[PDB]
Design a protein around this nucleic acid. Structure first.
Length: 109
RNA sequence: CUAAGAAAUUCACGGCGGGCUUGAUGUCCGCGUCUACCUGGUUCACUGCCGUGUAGGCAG
């Protein structure tokens, strides 16, 4: 999770729908699993569901920066696609977990 | 049209003081190395060489 790190309680509340449920970790479907705890009006329920779905979405516009490592890749006989590679945070956290399994812990030691 | 394009790491400094490495010792026994060969351009179209001077008597 990336952003202002003072609202970590909201991500903690939205991060319990997969540890024993089918409405927060599986909130892409299951409208019964979405309405299983709301009990409020339909407008406030729809606004809360939209706000909960907008936690793994875009920031507002597709925007790069002048300090963001853009590149040209050449096509077979034609012009170009511009390529803006990003940093794989998830993959490198997976590989840091695998390297601490392989270098440290208790069994490898 | 390249994880694209940019970039001052800087100043200064006491490593010192001491010290027993010792004692002992079997390297031994044995053996088939043969077979054959042209250094022959002028080891200079040259060192001493009538003129060093494409002319010459020139240990040719």
């Amino acid at each position: 999770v990336v952003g202002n790190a003072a609202a970590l309680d909201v991500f903690k509340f939205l991060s319990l729908q997969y540890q024993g449920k089918n409405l927060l970790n599986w909130l892409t479907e299951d409208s019964a699993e979405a309405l299983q705890a709301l009990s409020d009006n339909a407008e406030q329920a729809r606004e809360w569901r939209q706000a909960f779905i907008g936690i793994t979405t875009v920031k507002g516009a597709p925007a790069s920066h002048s300090l963001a490592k853009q590149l040209y890749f050449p096509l077979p006989g034609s012009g170009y696609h511009l390529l803006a590679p990003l940093f794989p945070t998830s993959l490198v956290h997976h590989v840091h977990a695998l390297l601490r399994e392989a270098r440290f812990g208790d069994a490898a030691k």
